[PDB]
């Protein structure tokens, strides 16, 4: 099978453990109301600003997709209503259709 | 007083709100067991690795300071014990000092 040298396996295992220890360290900082000073210790001012900007970009990407999905579903529902209205008019009883023309003058 | 243009005040207020929204977004992700995929969305693999490495550097800096503080307190306690032992020997009754020399042969 696709294996790897014991050097690369140790580097990947240390990299994994170091990342898990960061996530757990920040989790306990949130539970002790100490996440704000820890983030200032872990991140430079430019890196914190980059993270805030990335949150805005994600919001702008999600809202752009949502409005695009709503526009697609609105046009599809509008077409579905026209086709369903046409079929319902052709399937309607003649008494109803005869009366609908009289209201149209 | 030291004020600032309304442009810079708006940029600083947006920067502040964007950072607060990131901290709150990650806090709710920890409470929903969704912090791991959110961090992968917010951070590239190199940036996550850098954060794990920074946690190890902080541990190595703190342990280096702790062992240096323990070495300083041990040497100070050792000197304090010698000076306190010397004073206690000179303040001891003569009956005790006379007997301590006899045990020394």
Author numbering:
A (entry chain A), B (entry chain A): 1 to 105
Text of the article:
Hereafter, the Val58Ile TrpR protein after protease cleavage is referred to as cleaved. The structures of free and l-Trp-soaked cleaved Val58Ile ds-TrpR were determined to 2.05 and 2.45 Å resolution, respectively, and refined to an R work/R free of 26.8/29.9% and 27.8/29.1%, respectively. A clear example of this effect is illustrated by the common observation of components of crystallization solvents in seemingly well localized sites on protein surfaces, as for iPrOH in the l-Trp site of the l-Trp-free ds-TrpR structure here, which has a B factor similar to those of its surrounding residues, as does l-Trp in the l-Trp-soaked structure. The structures of cleaved Val58Ile ds-TrpR with and without soaked l-Trp have only minor differences in overall structure (r.m.s.d. of 0.56 Å for all non-H protein atoms). The results presented here demonstrate that the structure of domain-swapped Val58Ile TrpR is also essentially identical to that of wild-type ds-TrpR.
